[PDB]
Amino acid sequence: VPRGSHMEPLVTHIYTADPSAHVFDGKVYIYPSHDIDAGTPENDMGDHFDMRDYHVLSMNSIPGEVTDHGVALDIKDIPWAGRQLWAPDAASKDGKYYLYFPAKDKEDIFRIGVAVSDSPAGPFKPESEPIKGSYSIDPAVFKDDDGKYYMYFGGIWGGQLQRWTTGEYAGHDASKTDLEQDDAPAIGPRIALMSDDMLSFAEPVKEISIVDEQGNPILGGDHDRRFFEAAWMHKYNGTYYLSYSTGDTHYIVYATGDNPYGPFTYRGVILNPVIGWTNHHSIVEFNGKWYLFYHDSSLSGGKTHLRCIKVTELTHNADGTIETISPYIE
Ligand SMILES: O[C@@H]1[C@@H](O)[C@H](O[C@@H]2CO[C@@H](O)[C@H](O)[C@H]2O)OC[C@H]1O
Ligand SMILES: OC[C@@H]1O[C@H](O)[C@H](O)[C@H]1O
Ligand code: NA
Ligand code: NA
């Protein structure tokens, strides 16, 4: 049956989260987390998110029938991974499809790996080790108009980004949150140009600067605006849009810049807070309309770790501003 007409859950037979949407082969492919009621301890490091596989979804139209393509990747088959298959993304280059995914290695450190297929629907064969120089969570692999591909990534608190300031993991007894200096600039998300073969980074990882409208860094204490997790990149009218979740303040916000690396100037809110703690989205153009894919905890009756993906239309103004979506108004 067709789905996606009035912000209803796109699928209900499994719990789904963290939707990363792409247009491949004229269809919308969605790469979400597959939530399960693991019953694991709930805490600020996110141990209650104990996902173990990925299912790829696809739609031929919006609204439309949603196809679940089965298990595309299972954690038991990822040689380096110990636990926690968190928000994934995909890319397409030269007839191959690449699934990028965050998982904890056997020392309980989040890294990002890649798995490879000949189909956007998978299934995918994981590389035996994670990407060298990767860390933390939430990859977004963005193909720019010039054919260069960039991985945006990172997440604070349970995503461990705050433990990576030196290029080496600070340890399990290091900060559980951020830099713990609220008057310093907030931690920024990471970016690296991808290698030609899509399996590695082509440069040392860079940190993205996010500033306010005056050009001053967004500060660590500014939880309404500062980066938490769920980076996404899209382009509109030649401008680069870095959007992301603010975490404990529950917003998707956006910031604009003139190149992949920024700096990005904070503009405003994309999506107001949803049912359930997390807020994770993607923004995609399909048949000349822009869509915001997102999730909430509505289907589970409010359980933060049992989510369902949804979609709604997103409106850019010609001046590059985006109209804020409030999830439960119409
Ligand atoms: O890494 C992130 C976790 O730090 C985050 O943990 C949340 C923190 O606030 C608590 O009230 C919530 O219950 C808990 O989920 O969860 C999201 C994860 O990506
Ligand atoms: O869903 C697991 C994690 O929580 C947040 O939604 C984050 O973006 C994702 O990787
Ligand atoms: Na993302
Ligand atoms: Na707004």
Side-chain angles (χ1 to χ4, degrees):
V1 290
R3 287 281 185 270
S5 58
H6 54 281
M7 298 172 136
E8 84 277 28
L10 288 172
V11 306
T12 59
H13 68 277
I14 52 168
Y15 288 112
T16 52
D18 304 316
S20 287
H22 294 264
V23 180
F24 300 137
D25 293 333
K27 298 179 195 295
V28 177
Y29 285 88
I30 306 151
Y31 302 85
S33 296
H34 175 204
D35 283 341
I36 55 178
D37 193 9
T40 43
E42 182 188 358
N43 56 45
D44 293 4
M45 300 166 66
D47 289 324
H48 57 300
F49 301 104
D50 192 32
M51 305 85 84
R52 294 153 201 180
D53 65 46
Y54 298 121
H55 291 230
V56 178
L57 311 177
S58 67
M59 299 175 79
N60 301 327
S61 60
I62 303 170
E65 177 175 14
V66 182
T67 297
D68 175 353
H69 294 272
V71 176
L73 181 61
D74 191 310
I75 194 169
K76 71 203 196 101
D77 301 323
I78 306 173
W80 65 265
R83 65 184 180 118
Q84 295 177 293
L85 296 195
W86 280 16
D89 199 17
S92 169
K93 191 179 180 178
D94 299 331
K96 292 198 172 97
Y97 293 85
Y98 300 89
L99 186 70
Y100 297 92
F101 63 90
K104 279 187 182 148
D105 70 14
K106 296 180 193 301
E107 307 189 333
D108 245 21
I109 297 172
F110 273 124
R111 313 285 189 164
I112 297 167
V114 65
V116 187
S117 188
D118 65 328
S119 172
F124 299 83
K125 176 174 197 65
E127 294 294 301
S128 65
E129 294 294 336
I131 291 160
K132 197 197 316 295
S134 79
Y135 45 92
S136 194
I137 65 164
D138 290 7
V141 177
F142 169 69
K143 190 185 177 186
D144 204 353
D145 303 312
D146 61 1
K148 292 177 192 177
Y149 296 76
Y150 297 91
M151 183 184 287
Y152 294 84
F153 66 102
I156 65 172
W157 296 31
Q160 303 176 340
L161 182 58
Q162 72 284 0
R163 301 185 172 171
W164 280 97
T165 64
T166 67
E168 299 182 330
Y169 186 66
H172 297 324
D173 52 4
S175 175
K176 297 183 58 152
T177 53
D178 58 16
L179 300 178
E180 311 174 283
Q181 178 43 259
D182 282 356
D183 297 308
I187 296 162
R190 304 303 205 250
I191 184 177
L193 181 68
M194 296 298 299
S195 66
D196 292 353
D197 73 7
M198 298 286 283
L199 306 179
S200 69
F201 296 153
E203 63 177 323
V205 174
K206 304 299 190 294
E207 181 174 4
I208 291 158
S209 285
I210 303 168
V211 297
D212 67 23
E213 299 89 331
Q214 270 31 253
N216 296 319
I218 299 300
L219 300 179
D222 186 0
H223 290 198
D224 285 352
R225 297 191 297 180
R226 68 93 180 74
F227 182 76
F228 193 106
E229 68 196 347
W232 185 257
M233 177 51 56
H234 80 273
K235 289 179 71 169
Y236 183 85
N237 251 227
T239 297
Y240 293 80
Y241 288 68
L242 177 68
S243 58
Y244 56 88
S245 174
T246 59
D248 62 317
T249 57
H250 313 283
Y251 300 118
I252 307 304
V253 303
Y254 77 111
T256 51
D258 65 21
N259 76 99
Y261 297 89
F264 293 94
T265 297
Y266 178 91
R267 302 305 291 282
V269 179
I270 295 286
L271 186 62
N272 281 310
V274 294
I275 297 158
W277 197 96
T278 65
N279 200 346
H280 193 126
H281 73 302
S282 59
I283 295 168
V284 62
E285 190 176 19
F286 182 54
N287 297 314
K289 291 187 147 184
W290 287 93
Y291 295 93
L292 181 71
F293 285 84
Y294 62 103
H295 72 231
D296 72 14
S297 296
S298 61
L299 186 68
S300 70
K303 296 187 180 171
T304 279
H305 76 288
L306 299 177
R307 294 158 294 178
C308 52
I309 68 166
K310 294 178 170 179
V311 67
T312 197
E313 286 176 42
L314 188 74
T315 299
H316 296 87
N317 296 310
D319 71 2
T321 61
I322 295 171
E323 294 182 348
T324 304
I325 297 136
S326 294
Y328 311 119
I329 292 187
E330 284 96 63

